């Protein structure tokens, strides 16, 4: 097995970092990078359970995974409504371990961001709020707390639903 | 010099109102919270810095009350000043060989520095002056119930550098705690004190600094922070008369019966203090 | 998991009621031409906002009576069935209660979808 | 939870009254298919509107004395029982009071349905 | 330079009527509200901007009273002015290497800029002028009862881009507050004054501005804002003479006995001021 | 350009009689009312449009008195007019890169448009001409007593579609305020009037408009709108000598003793205007 402090290390490093592409030359401003996510995935596999290995399993329906995807689409709506330079106050640590007491305001701000979006001719867009309804559907209530392994599932789901929305894929001649 | 012969435990209640009591360097500048419970945290070094600022202000940097200042002071230069003040050589990258010499440099760093004498210091660097623990300690201040940090987006009509995109304007940010009642615990140990000569006048200066800590530390990012209650437990002897947890549990902070919404004033809270054991005297007059 | 009509928890009820009120308003006019949004003050002030929300919703539903388009009186029946379990509107909500409010909103919104909640 | 006839709170009772009045004037004349509506005015300015509302309700129930259609003097006895519980109609109501007004009105409208609240 | 020899604390009551006292950038343009209790918020930055506007109006840019203008100024140009006024080289990004020269450039920026001498400034940019706290701090203004902001959908008989039916139609929107009596708290510290030279003429201009912030800041968005009370507490010492929360709690702002519905005019509210502590003098003459 | 050198404050009373003084685009088309007190509101934009139409009627589009046409107008074409008439290139989406050019474009906008010269404008678009605040500001008009709007269901003896639905009949509606006396507040600031050249002829045209706003704004939906009182406060300075609320609280509107039911005519109301302060002159002759 892996050490039982591998996952808390990657968790507490996800919290202690922030997007700053103006300081690094290699293009990556993500806080859940390919390596932190791959390492949390390996921990969850060889210590806990089998999880999604692929870009996104939208048929997953496990509350930590789903909440991670919801957080991902919220931050996508935010970064699409306002370019964000590229700074945003960090709630990933807060939402990963205490989803309710943060997701309430997160969803309200996401409503505001989709509003700012729809005010412009950028709505026929509108499938962000549709994705949010879809994800909230499978969720009976926002859980009070989440265990560290549930937090790792949260991070994996965030990474998945984050690469699902980006536009860079298979670029090699 | 003289020092205190009583063990002292204190509980200080301070609150904030539409302010940011302490920022997080890693969370942007969002207030410090415990990410698993949402309670707001205030580092001990923050309150120590506020006490240092109050002492540097009410004493204007007098003798025996210098402060290890925040005006971009060089700590190695202060150590070297200590070495020249004791008439020794600072070129050793470690402590002096003769233990009396190290004792002199450390008694000098403590004798004329309130914040070292009180909160201790680590002066083991390129010019080593040693280590001090210092009698007064404080732990992170934790609010009574979870705080909800709200982000107040603001703007500014002006641009700093040459910007060619400004109807348009640059956006700023603020984080305020609409309200948080915070609780902090402290320990004043007489053995470490007698090691540092932390006196009685130092203690009364510290109590006043605890009361009037926030009356002068105002800014565009703090709102109205205020020290509401200050409960002090004087044990009757140099060691303890009762555990610390037995005292820090006498201070019950609950919400008053009438109020129902989110806490928004100190009158939304009730604070009661029990009767201390036979070995401890509790003073809530601060 | 889906909408639960027997949840009968006040934040869930308020979220559903808010969803159906904004559904009535959007069935009145597409979007005038823009979805009027004061969810913020609604979760801030539940009652002081919901009463005028209910007035405007009565306007919208009474206006939708002339047109034969229906999906309209069902909205009023739903308003009754939601308010029936509610009493004494809440002065303030909490963090988990506001999260539950949003959850119930999105549930009732999925229920009234153009596909009538048959696709996921 | 549902309508509690033992509430005895001025806004709740005023809303109950408004509901029974609009149901009574709804049984008098058709609504034909079109109605003049001042629910907002009755919630906001209670006395200034309930004066004329009680006037028209008295006129209606005086009209319906001749016909034995009784579901009706039932509506009149509800109105009387409600007014006995409301003394000194207020001049204006605060927003929370208007929320309670809407709550009571909707409780009554659900109680006075054609199925008589036998199905939720 | 001359400074104030006293500590000041002021409570400013102002109210709006069918207007947007302050809009929220990342909320559309809705009036800032407390997202958990409804009460409305007006940032301290808004009141500071109205004070700077009253000064820029009533002083006509007179020397020693420049205002860090709203006119789309490039602040680094004002920093370069501060430097060339002193014949230093701002080529680096850091302060002057000498402490006297850093004090020179900072004292210069505070010498002839009212808002810097009063509200402080963050002048650390590509050309670094330093940092100032400014004696006069202000906190968020919070209404006495929760405001219910309502959107008013309006039309425009004209169109910018091509259109020939205005059938398509677009609605504008004005967010208004039917009423709200806002209270703001403020602090004035003699130590930071000695640092910047905030004199008595600066303070009289300040009270006048506070009285008349809204008398000239009219627009198609604010409706009728007006300063109703100004309660100022004048301690007898450069450092405090009583806690600030106690002074602010002397000011009780409730609703009059004869008012019952929603508040819609300052006559709906009764505002009383308790008797000040032993070492403070209260001046409600403004 | 010549401009007013004084500050003006005015109260305008106007009433309606079985009419819809201002329709609500969001809430059907019923009159705007305060959703908590029932008082009917009239936007200040409404009165601004009435004044614009009065000026366009009585000036027939004379030179220096164009009005930002209502019947139809493209604001971008007017902005491009401004750019050609000052010899610029409107290609950018922002103001010119030179300050004097932008100033001249905006001054040419204000120089030949009465309603820009008066109420200001926002001409930041694909062809930016800038921003003007306008000296003259009006706030929402709020009725003296809660209006009880009553719908009026009406019919029509005709069908507008190639469909058989007329037994079955078509039904319209009309929202009439049986009577409502409104009170609108207004401000004219000499500084912005200097920024725009709001002349004395502009002010006499404005007073004329206010007196005769409704004499030509008649329709099937407005009934009888009439301007009943106009109280104007001129100060003896460019920055006023009294707070605006002090002067607005001089026009007291009550109900005469003879009337007891709801108000239905202006004879039910009594208006009194107090004595102006030592520095202001009140004229009620309009």
Contact D39 C52 (CB under 8 A): no
For residue B90, give both structure tokens.
């600072």
Spatial distance between the Cα atoms of F215 and F209, rounded to a whole number of angstroms: 10
- Considering only CB atoms, A104 lies closest to which of C37, C99, C113, namely C99
Spatial distance between the Cα atoms of A143 and F88, rounded to a whole number of angstroms: 62
Ordered alpha helix ranges (H), chain E = 44-58, 75-84, 99-111, 114-119, 190-196, 200-211, 244-250
Spatial distance between the Cα atoms of E177 and E31, rounded to a whole number of angstroms: 8
Q: B94 near B83, Cβ under 8 Å?
A: no
- Considering only CB atoms, A90 lies closest to which of B27, B37, B173, namely B27
**What dihedral angle (degrees, nearest 10) is formed by the CA atoms of D54, D59, D62, D67?**
-110
Identify all chain F residues contacting D38, using CB atoms and an 8 Å cutoff: 148-150
Spatial distance between the Cα atoms of D20 and D105, rounded to a whole number of angstroms: 8
Q: Chain F residues contacting C, CB < 8 Å?
A: 25-28, 30, 35-36, 171
- What are the residues facing E273 on neighbouring strands? E251
- Residue written as tokens 């701000």? A109
What pairing do the DSSP bridges indicate for beta strands F121-123 and E150-154? unpaired
Spatial distance between the Cα atoms of E91 and E75, rounded to a whole number of angstroms: 16
D5 touches chain E (CB under 8 A): no
Q: Give, as one character, the DSSP assignment of residue F139.
A: P
Residue E259 DSSP SS3: coil
C37: left (phi over 0), alpha (psi -120 to 50) or beta: beta
CA-based diameter of chain A, in Å? 53
Chains B and A touch (3+ CB pairs under 8 A): yes
Contact A15 B26 (CB under 8 A): yes
What pairing do the DSSP bridges indicate for beta strands F150-155 and F226-235? unpaired
Spatial distance between the Cα atoms of D82 and D85, rounded to a whole number of angstroms: 5
Chains D and B touch (3+ CB pairs under 8 A): no
Neighbours of E74 (CB within 10 A): 15
Q: Give, as one character, the DSSP assignment of residue F208.
A: H
Spatial distance between the Cα atoms of E131 and F66, rounded to a whole number of angstroms: 51
Tell me the backbone φ, ψ of residue E212, rounded to 5 degrees: -115, 30
For residue F156, give both structure tokens.
């029509």
Q: Quote the distance between the C-alpha of residue F33 and its chain's center.
A: 18
- What are the residues facing E16 on neighbouring strands? E180
Q: What angle do CA C95, C99, C103 make, to 5 degrees?
A: 165
Q: Which residues contact A167 (CB under 8 A, 6 or more apart)?
A: none
Instruction: Name the strand (E) or helix (H) holding D92.
Output: none
| Secondary structure (DSSP) of A3-26 | -TTHHHHHHHHHHS----TTT-SS
Q: In chain E, which ranges are E strands?
A: 8-16, 41-42, 121-123, 130-132, 136-138, 141-143, 150-154, 172-176, 180-188, 226-235, 251-255, 269-273, 280-283
Spatial distance between the Cα atoms of B267 and A21, rounded to a whole number of angstroms: 46
Chains A and D touch (3+ CB pairs under 8 A): no
Identify all chain E residues contacting C56, using CB atoms and an 8 Å cutoff: none
Per the document, the length of chain D is 120
Spatial distance between the Cα atoms of F247 and F283, rounded to a whole number of angstroms: 12
Q: B141 near B128, Cβ under 8 Å?
A: no
Spatial distance between the Cα atoms of B96 and B74, rounded to a whole number of angstroms: 21
With CA atoms as reference, report the closest residue to B184 among B16, B12, B21. Answer: B12
Spatial distance between the Cα atoms of F42 and E149, rounded to a whole number of angstroms: 17
For residue D104, give both structure tokens.
């009571």
Spatial distance between the Cα atoms of C93 and C98, rounded to a whole number of angstroms: 6
> How far is the CA of A82 from the CAs of A31, A167, F90, in angstroms?
19, 18, 28
- What are the residues facing E159 on neighbouring strands? F74
Identify all chain E residues contacting C98, using CB atoms and an 8 Å cutoff: 36
> How far is the CA of F89 from the CAs of E162, F79, F86, F96, F105, in angstroms?
21, 11, 9, 8, 11
Spatial distance between the Cα atoms of B183 and B142, rounded to a whole number of angstroms: 5
Query: After which residues is the backbone of chain C broken at C–N > 2.5 Å?
Result: 31, 71
Burial class (CB in 10 A: 0-12, 13-18, 19+), E67: buried
Q: What was the structure determination method? A: cryo-EM
- Measure in Å the smallest separation between the Cα of A23 and chain C Cα atoms: 36
Q: Give, as one character, the DSSP assignment of residue E40.
A: B
Spatial distance between the Cα atoms of B220 and B29, rounded to a whole number of angstroms: 14
D2 touches chain C (CB under 8 A): yes
C117 touches chain F (CB under 8 A): no
For residue F219, give both structure tokens.
């329709």
D48 touches chain E (CB under 8 A): no
Resolution, given in Å to one decimal, reads: 3.1
Contact B30 A93 (CB under 8 A): no
Query: After which residues is the backbone of chain A broken at C–N > 2.5 Å?
Result: 84, 124
Q: Which of F79, F92, F94, F96 to mutate against chain B (most B CBs within 10 Å)?
A: F94
With CA atoms as reference, report the closest residue to E219 among E22, E13, E69. Answer: E22
C48 touches chain B (CB under 8 A): no
Q: Which residues contact F182 (CB under 8 A, 6 or more apart)?
A: F13, F14, F15, F16, F21, F40, F42, F141, F142, F143, F144
Instruction: Name the strand (E) or helix (H) holding A127.
Output: helix A127-137
Instruction: Name the strand (E) or helix (H) holding E63.
Output: none
Q: Treating both helix axes as pointing N-terminal to C-terminal, what angle do D46-63 and D10-28 enclose, rounded to 10 degrees?
A: 40
Q: Which of C10, C45, C92, C98 to mutate against chain B (most B CBs within 10 Å)?
A: C92
B159 touches chain E (CB under 8 A): yes
Spatial distance between the Cα atoms of B268 and B255, rounded to a whole number of angstroms: 6
- What are the residues facing B181 on neighbouring strands? B15
Q: Which residues contact A163 (CB under 8 A, 6 or more apart)?
A: A55, A56
Spatial distance between the Cα atoms of E100 and F199, rounded to a whole number of angstroms: 53
- Residue written as tokens 């204006």? D92
Spatial distance between the Cα atoms of B155 and B160, rounded to a whole number of angstroms: 13
For residue A165, give both structure tokens.
């929305």
Nearest CA in chain C to D11: C88
Q: Count the alpha carbons within 13 Å of F99 in the hemisphere toward its beta carbon.
A: 3
Q: F7 near F247, Cβ under 8 Å?
A: no
Spatial distance between the Cα atoms of E67 and E89, rounded to a whole number of angstroms: 24
- What are the residues facing E229 on neighbouring strands? E13
D8 touches chain F (CB under 8 A): no
Q: Count the alpha carbons within 13 Å of A78 in the hemisphere toward its beta carbon.
A: 20
Instruction: Name the strand (E) or helix (H) holding A91.
Output: none
Q: Could you tell me how many helices (H) and strands (E) chain A has, helices first? A: 7, 0
When computed from its CA atoms, the radius of gyration of chain A, rounded to whole angstroms, is 16
- Residue written as tokens 């932008």? F102
Identify all chain A residues contacting E27, using CB atoms and an 8 Å cutoff: 112
For residue B66, give both structure tokens.
């210098």
3-state secondary structure chain B: CCCCCCCEEEEEEEEEEEECCCECCCCCCCECECCCCCCEEECHHHHHHHHHHHHHHHCCCCCCCCCCCCCCCCHHHHHHHHHHHCCCCCCCCCCCCCHHHHHHHHHHHHHCCHHHHHHCEEECCCCCCEEECCCEEECCEEECCCCCCEECCEEECCECCCCCCCCCCEEECCEEEEEEEEEEEEEECHHHHHHHCCCHHHHHHHHHHHHCCCCCCCCCCCCCCEEEEEEEEEECCCCCCCCHHHHHCCEEEEECCCCCCCCCCHHHEEEEECCCCCCEEEECCC
For residue E94, give both structure tokens.
């850091």
Burial class (CB in 10 A: 0-12, 13-18, 19+), A143: middle
**What dihedral angle (degrees, nearest 10) is formed by the CA atoms of C96, C100, C106, C108?**
-170
Spatial distance between the Cα atoms of E95 and B49, rounded to a whole number of angstroms: 24
- Chains meeting C at 3+ CB pairs closer than 8 A? A, B, D, E, F
- Chains meeting F at 3+ CB pairs closer than 8 A? B, C, D, E
Spatial distance between the Cα atoms of E76 and F262, rounded to a whole number of angstroms: 64
Burial F126-159 (b: 16+ CB within 10 A, else e): ebbbbebbbbbbbbbbbbbbbbbbbbeeeeeeee
Spatial distance between the Cα atoms of B253 and B250, rounded to a whole number of angstroms: 9
Q: Which of E178, E222, E263 to mutate against chain F (most F CBs within 10 Å)?
A: E178
Tell me the backbone φ, ψ of residue F154, rounded to 5 degrees: -130, 165
Q: Give, as one character, the DSSP assignment of residue C88.
A: S
For residue A31, give both structure tokens.
């806080």
- Measure in Å the smallest separation between the Cα of D92 and chain C Cα atoms: 15
B167 touches chain F (CB under 8 A): yes
Spatial distance between the Cα atoms of A53 and C33, rounded to a whole number of angstroms: 43
Q: Count the alpha carbons within 13 Å of A131 in the hemisphere toward its beta carbon.
A: 22
E154 touches chain F (CB under 8 A): yes
Spatial distance between the Cα atoms of E78 and E59, rounded to a whole number of angstroms: 19
- Considering only CB atoms, C102 lies closest to which of A101, A104, A118, namely A104
With CA atoms as reference, report the closest residue to F21 among F138, F141, F154, F119. Answer: F141
Nearest CA in chain C to E37: C44
Q: Which of E24, E27, E171, E173 to mutate against chain A (most A CBs within 10 Å)?
A: E27
- Chains meeting E at 3+ CB pairs closer than 8 A? A, B, C, D, F
């Amino acid at each position: 097995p892996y050490p039982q402090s591998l996952l808390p290390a990657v968790l507490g490093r996800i919290r202690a970092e922030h997007a700053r592409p103006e300081d690094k030359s290699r293009y990556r401003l993500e806080v859940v990078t390919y390596y932190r996510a791959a390492l949390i995935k390996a921990y969850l596999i060889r210590n806990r359970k089998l999880e999604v290995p692929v870009s996104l399993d939208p048929a997953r329906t496990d509350r930590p995974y789903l909440l991670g995807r919801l957080f991902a689409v919220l931050e996508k709506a935010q970064e699409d409504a306002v370019p964000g330079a590229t700074i945003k106050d960090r709630y990933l640590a807060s939402a990963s371990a205490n989803p309710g007491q943060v997701f309430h305001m997160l969803l309200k701000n996401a409503s505001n961001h989709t509003a700012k979006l729809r005010k412009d001719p950028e709505r026929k867009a509108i499938h962000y709020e549709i994705m949010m309804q879809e994800i909230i559907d499978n969720i009976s209530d926002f859980p009070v707390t989440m265990s560290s392994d549930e937090q790792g599932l949260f991070m994996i789901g965030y990474y998945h639903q984050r690469k699902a929305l980006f536009t860079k894929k298979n670029k090699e001649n | 010099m003289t020092a205190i012969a009583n063990r002292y435990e204190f509980v200080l209640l301070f609150d904030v109102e539409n302010g940011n009591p302490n920022g997080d360097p890693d969370a942007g500048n969002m207030p410090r919270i415990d990410p698993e419970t949402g309670h707001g945290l205030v580092t001990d070094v923050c309150l120590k810095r506020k006490i240092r600022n109050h002492v540097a202000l009410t004493k204007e940097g007098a003798e025996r009350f210098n402060i290890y200042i925040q005006e971009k002071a060089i700590l190695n230069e202060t150590h070297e000043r200590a070495y020249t003040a004791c008439d020794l050589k600072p070129e050793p990258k470690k402590l002096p060989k003769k233990v009396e010499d190290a004792k002199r440099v450390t008694d000098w760093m403590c004798t004329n520095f309130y914040d070292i004498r009180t909160f201790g210091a680590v002066m083991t660097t390129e010019v080593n002056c040693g280590q001090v623990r210092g009698p007064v300690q404080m732990a992170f201040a934790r609010s009574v119930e979870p705080v909800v940090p709200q982000e107040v987006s603001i703007t500014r009509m002006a641009v700093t550098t040459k910007a060619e995109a400004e109807d348009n304007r640059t956006m700023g940010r603020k984080h305020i705690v609409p309200y948080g009642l915070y609780v902090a615990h402290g320990f004043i140990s007489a053995p470490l004190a007698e090691k540092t000569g932390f006196s009685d006048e130092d203690l009364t200066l510290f109590w006043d600094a605890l009361v009037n800590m926030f009356e002068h530390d105002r800014s565009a990012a703090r709102g109205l922070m205020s020290s509401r209650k200050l409960i002090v437990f004087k044990h009757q002897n140099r060691l303890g008369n009762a555990p610390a947890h037995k005292l820090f549990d006498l201070v019950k902070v609950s919400r008053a019966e009438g109020s129902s919404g989110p806490a928004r004033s100190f009158a939304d809270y009730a604070v009661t203090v029990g009767q201390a054991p036979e070995g401890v005297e509790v003073k809530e007059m601060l | 998991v889906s909408l639960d009509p027997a949840r009968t928890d006040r934040p869930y009820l308020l979220g559903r009621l808010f969803a159906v009120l904004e559904k009535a308003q959007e069935d009145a006019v597409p979007g005038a031409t823009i979805k009027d949004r004061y969810l913020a003050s609604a979760s801030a002030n539940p009652g002081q906002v919901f009463h005028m929300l209910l007035k405007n919703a009565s306007n919208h539903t009474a206006k939708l009576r002339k047109d034969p388009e229906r999906k309209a009186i069902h909205y009023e029946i739903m308003m009754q069935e939601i308010i029936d379990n509610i009493s004494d509107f809440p002065v303030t909500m909490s963090s988990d209660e506001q999260g539950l409010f949003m959850i119930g909103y999105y549930h009732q919104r999925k229920a009234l979808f153009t596909k009538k909640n048959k696709e996921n």
